[PDB]
Amino acid sequence: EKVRIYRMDGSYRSVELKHGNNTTVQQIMEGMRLSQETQQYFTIWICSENLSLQLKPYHKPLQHVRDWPEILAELTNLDPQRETPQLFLRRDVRLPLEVEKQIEDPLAILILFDEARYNLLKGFYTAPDAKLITLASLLLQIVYGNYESKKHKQGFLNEENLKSIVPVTKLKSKAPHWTNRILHEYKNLSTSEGVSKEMHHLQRMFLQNCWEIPTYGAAFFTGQIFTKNHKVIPVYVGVNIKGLHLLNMETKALLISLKYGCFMWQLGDTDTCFQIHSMENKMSFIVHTKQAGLVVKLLMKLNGQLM
Amino acid sequence: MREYKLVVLGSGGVGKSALTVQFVQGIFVEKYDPTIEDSYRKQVEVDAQQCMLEILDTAGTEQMRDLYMKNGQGFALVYSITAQSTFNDLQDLREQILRVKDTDDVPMILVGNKCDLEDERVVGKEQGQNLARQWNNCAFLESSAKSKINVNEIFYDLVRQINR
Ligand SMILES: Nc1nc2c(ncn2[C@@H]2O[C@H](COP(=O)(O)OP(=O)(O)NP(=O)(O)O)[C@@H](O)[C@H]2O)c(=O)[nH]1
Ligand SMILES: *Cc1c(O)ccc2cc(C#C)ccc12
Ligand SMILES: [Mg+2]
C-alpha cells in the first residue's frame, strides 16, 4: 500500500503505507527522505481546490481523504464533486519565524522556497512594488541563471516569462511597467560577485525578502463579511505566527492585517462566525465562515506561542 | 513552455535517485532509500528555449513499468560501473521500451554511473561504448552523482533527442 505525497511545485514522493489507511502522519513523515533537521519544519496537509487543512502527527490522512465530502460539508458550502483531495508536504503553520531564520539545510530551504514561490505567484503575498520586483529578480537568477545582455536585455520578459516571476494579480496592470527595474536588479545580482550564487544561498535570499511580508507562512481559510444596503464580500482569512490578515477573495487585496497583541477575537455561539476587535481603533468586524472554530483555535495557539 | 516527460530506469542501487536529485535540487543523496516512485519538475534552458522537465524516478526491483514507457518521451538507462548485473539488466529494458513504443526511434541514453568509484570499477568504459553502438549508436555517458560529472548532460541530451 502506498500514497503520493505532493509538494507545491507538482512533484511527489511515493511512501509505503505500513498500516494501510490506519497509517498516521508521523509514520508517513518517517517514510520520506528527511533527516530530523529537515523533518521538524514541515508536516502533512490535505488539500483540495478550495480547502487546505494542516494535519496532526496522530491523524490518519487516508481516512480524511475518505471522509473528505463530509469535511467539506462541515467546514464549507463548497461543491464536493469538484474537490478530490491530495496529500502535501508543507511548512508547519506553527513554525516560529525565529526558528526558520536560522535554517541552513539545503533541502529544507528549497522546500520552503518552492512553497513561498507558490504563494507569491498566486497573489497571496501583499507587498510594495519594490519588494515584488526584488523577488522577481531573484527568481530570474534562480531559474534562468546569470544575466546575459544578449538574451535578456530586450525581447525576453514577455508575459509568458513574467508569469513565472510576478504575482498573477499584477501580471496585467502593473508588472509590464516593472520589466526595466527587474532586469536591472537581475543584472546587479549576476555581476555582484559579493552575492553567492549557490542555489540554496539564492533561495534563502528569496525567503529573507518573504519573511517581512505580513501573510508569510499563513494558513488561509474562506469566509464572508458584510459591509456597512449590506453587501457581501468574500474573503480569505490568513492566520500565521504574526497575526490575522484579511484578503479580498477576488482581488487578493489586503483588507486588514493585525499583529498579535493588537486585537482580540471571540467565537460566535453558533460556531459559524467569529468577531475581531481591533484594539486602539474602536473598529470591530465579524467574519462568517464554517471554519470559525478552526480559525479561533489556531489564533489562540499561535498567540500563545509568542513571548 | 514545452513539457518533456523523462524516465530514469535501471536496476536497484545504480544511482537513479542520486542523479535525479543532484540535477534537480543540487544535493547528493547519501543514504540508500529504495525508491517506490518519485516525480520531479525542473525548468531548464536547452538550445535557447525554456523547457519544463517532468522526471520520473522509478523503482529498480519490481514492475507499472509498461505505463512508464507508454507515457515517457525520453529514457535514461542507468547502470553502475561497480555492479556487472546492473549492466546486464539494461538489455531487457532497452528491448521492452522499443516494444511498447513499437519503434526504434526512441530518445534514450546509456548512463554508466559512479564513475567517481574508479578503484571499484567492474564494467569498463569501452564495454559501455560498445553496448551503446550495438543500440543503433545510442547516446552514452559516464557520470557521477557526487562529483557532478555529466549530470545535466543526461537530461539535456534527452531533450534534444525529443526535439529532433
Ligand atoms: N560514489 C557514488 N555513490 C553514488 C553515486 N550515485 C549514487 N551513489 C550511492 O549509491 C546508493 C544508491 O543510490 P540511489 O540513487 O538510491 O540508487 P537507486 O537506483 O535510486 N536505487 P533504487 O532502485 O532502490 O531506487 C547511495 O548510497 C548513493 O549515495 C555516484 O555517482 N557515486
Ligand atoms: C488546531 C490546530 C493546531 O493546534 C495547529 C495547527 C492547525 C492548523 C490548521 C490549518 C490549516 C487548523 C488547525 C490547527
Ligand atoms: Mg531510487
Author numbering:
A (entry chain A): 420 to 647, 652 to 730
B (entry chain B): 1 to 63, 67 to 167
Study text:
Herein, we characterize the 2-hydroxy-1-naphthaldehyde (HNA) fragment as a targeted covalent reversible ligand of a noncatalytic lysine (Lys720) of the Krev interaction trapped 1 (KRIT1) protein. The PPI between HEG1 and KRIT1 is believed to play an important role in controlling vascular development and permeability under normal and pathological conditions. The HEG1 binding domain of KRIT1 features three lysines, namely Lys475, Lys720, and Lys724; based on point mutation studies, these residues are essential for the interaction between HEG1 and KRIT1.14 The HNA was found to form a reversible imine adduct with Lys720, and SAR studies indicated that the HNA is the smallest/simplest 2-hydroxy-arylaldehyde that inhibits the HEG1-KRIT1 PPI. However, the interaction of HNA within the HEG1 binding pocket of KRIT1 induces proximity of the aldehyde moiety with the ε-amino group of Lys720, resulting in the specific targeting of this amino acid residue.
To evaluate the potential of the HNA as a site-directing fragment to identify HEG1-KRIT1 PPI inhibitors with potentially improved binding affinity and inhibition activity, we synthesized and screened a series of HNA derivatives bearing substitutions at the C6 or C7 position of the naphthalene ring. The C6 and C7 positions were selected for substitutions as an analysis of the available HNA-KRIT1 co-crystal structure indicated that these two positions may provide opportunities for analogs with improved complementarity to the HEG1 binding region of KRIT1. The co-crystal structures of 3, 5, and 6 in complex with KRIT1 revealed that these compounds exhibit similar binding modes as the parent HNA fragment, including the presence of the imine adduct between the aldehyde moiety of the HNA derivative and the ε-amino group of Lys720. However, compared to the unsubstituted HNA, derivatives 3, 5, and 6 established additional interactions with KRIT1. For example, the acetylene moiety of 3 formed a H-bond interaction with a water molecule, which, in turn, was involved in H-bond interactions with KRIT1 Phe693 and Ser471. Interestingly, the binding positions in the three crystal structures appeared nearly identical with the HNA binding pose generated in the MD simulations. This is particularly evident from the co-crystal structure with 3, where, in addition to the imine adduct with Lys720, Lys724 was found within H-bonding distance to the hydroxyl (2.87 Å), and Lys475 was within a π–cation interaction distance to the naphthalene ring (3.40 Å). In contrast, analogs 3 and 5, which are characterized by faster association kinetics and lower IC50 values in the FP assay, generated significant elevations in the expression of both KLF2 and KLF4.
